[PDB]
């Protein structure tokens, strides 16, 4: 059932609609409903090429912003990632754009929410299991954005970033213990 003060909800919808209108004004013949499938498949195959370690394809699939965010902390480790099931069809939750004049470039950013399950198991440089589990399709709720360069004549739809609200459940623990040292004092006194 709808909640009170739906005028602001409709105003947010209208802001997303005017962003979509600008995107359509720049480029026509762009349906809205088929996007979530495209984003889902792009996400799945980008993570597949991450598992296979194919940077020449991961570059075409994801943007330069999230290329290092996704490839740097995993350089010398082995990943076993696999999409198993789509729980519910993804929903486009936000469509915004900016009229940035610094280089005559306008970028369209669309956030789409997906709820699904996957199997992640990060191994070590020596082949030892580090973080994940092999065959336990744990459920994850993720909001990922996609950015396109409208002014560019080619402009592949690539994933830009992933947003995480603070209320999100904590991810699974680490299989190894960690020591966090206190202050490393020179000849002095400790106050705590």
């Amino acid at each position: 059932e709808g909640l009170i003060e739906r005028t602001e909800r409709m105003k947010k919808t209208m802001a997303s609609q005017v962003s979509i209108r600008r995107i359509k004004d720049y480029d026509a013949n762009f349906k809205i409903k088929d996007f979530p499938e495209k984003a889902k498949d792009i996400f799945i195959e980008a993570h597949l090429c991450l598992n296979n370690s194919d940077h020449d394809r991961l570059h075409t699939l994801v943007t330069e912003h999230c290329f290092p965010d996704m490839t740097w902390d995993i350089k010398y480790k082995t990943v076993r990632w696999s999409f198993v099931e789509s729980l519910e069809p993804s929903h486009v939750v936000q469509v915004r754009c900016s009229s940035m004049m610094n280089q005559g470039n306008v970028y369209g950013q669309i956030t789409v929410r997906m709820h699904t399950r996957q199997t992640l198991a990060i191994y070590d440089r020596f082949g030892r299991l580090m973080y994940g589990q092999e065959d336990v399709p744990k459920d994850v709720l993720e909001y990922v954005v996609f950015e396109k360069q409208l002014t560019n004549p080619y402009g592949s739809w690539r994933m830009h970033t992933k947003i995480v609200p603070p209320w999100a459940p904590p991810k699974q623990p680490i299989l190894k213990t960690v020591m966090i040292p206190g202050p490393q004092l020179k000849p002095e006194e400790e106050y705590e």
Partner: protein, 297 residues
């Protein structure tokens, strides 16, 4: 109570101990994190992110340094002495106690309990099989006395003999052979019903477990094991059985008039590797340890 060979008794005791340990490891489904703080004096402010009921204060010492592992004899989990291989349970604060600390009384008591347990393990497996050898308990004598003690009741046929110097040296040799193999002092906290069902045979051990589970509202008694020997003891123990450097058995004494049967008290003195004494001082301690010590009231 029925007929059972001592060998099969030890096998079944070990199987029950291992089954209980397995279920204790299993009732926790996943790895949980504990933030164990270091309230010691040398490395203050150090927090370890350890695993619940898996990791140990020895593992915390492994994180810190090798000197911690070598010298730390006991842990202090927010108020209390913990043996070095007891898995941690809650987010706590820890402090490591060595033999040369300002107040080493807790580690002295733990070391003497461990030495008494080793002496009992040596005694139980050094007599003829057709005699019934039973361990009564290890009295909590203070370190200020001359030696640690173990009470043992022998079969009726041995109510008139006395072991000689050669037999005493054989006991010391068995103790040194036990020392030579690095055996961790494994610990376990079990329920009263399980504690009774492990032993099930000795009425002395049964009453010991009753006395040790009465004062605890949760009816839990501590259990410790070296190799395949299992004893019931009060208080924690030292991590390894090779911590002892000088070990001996001095003499055995009788206390008859308090019971129709006979209860013998084996006595022995030991000194750790960190506190080894000279030959002459050790001879003095050996000569003193042969005296009967009566501290039970």
């Amino acid at each position: 109570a029925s007929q059972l060979s001592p060998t099969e008794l030890t096998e079944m005791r070990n199987d029950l101990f291992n089954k209980e340990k397995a279920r204790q490891l299993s009732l926790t489904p996943r790895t949980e994190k504990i933030e164990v703080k270091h309230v010691g004096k040398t490395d203050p402010g150090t927090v370890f992110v350890m695993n619940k009921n898996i990791s140990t204060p020895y593992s915390c010492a492994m994180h810190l340094s090798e000197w911690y592992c070598r010298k730390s004899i006991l842990a202090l989990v927010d108020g209390q002495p913990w043996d070095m291989y007891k898995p941690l349970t809650k987010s706590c604060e820890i402090k490591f106690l060595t033999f040369k600390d300002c107040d080493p009384g807790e580690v002295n008591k733990a070391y003497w309990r461990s030495c008494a347990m080793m002496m009992g393990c040596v005694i139980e497996r050094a007599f003829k099989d057709e005699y019934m050898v039973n361990l009564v308990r290890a009295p909590e004598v203070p370190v200020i006395s001359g030696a640690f003690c173990y009470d043992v009741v022998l079969d009726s046929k041995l109510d008139e003999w006395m072991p000689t110097k050669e037999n005493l040296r054989s006991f010391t040799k068995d103790a040194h052979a036990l020392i030579y193999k690095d055996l961790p002092f494994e610990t376990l906290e079990v329920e009263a019903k399980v504690a009774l069902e492990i032993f099930q045979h000795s009425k002395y051990k049964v009453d010991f477990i009753e006395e040790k589970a009465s004062q605890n509202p949760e009816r839990i008694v501590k259990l410790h094991r070296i190799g395949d020997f299992i004893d019931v003891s009060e208080g924690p123990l030292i991590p390894r059985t090779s911590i002892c450097f000088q070990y001996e058995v001095s003499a055995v004494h009788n206390l008859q008039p308090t019971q129709p049967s006979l209860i013998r008290r084996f006595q022995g003195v030991s000194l750790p590797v960190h506190l080894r004494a000279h030959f002459t001082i050790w001879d003095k301690l050996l000569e003193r340890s042969r005296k009967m010590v009566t501290e039970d009231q």
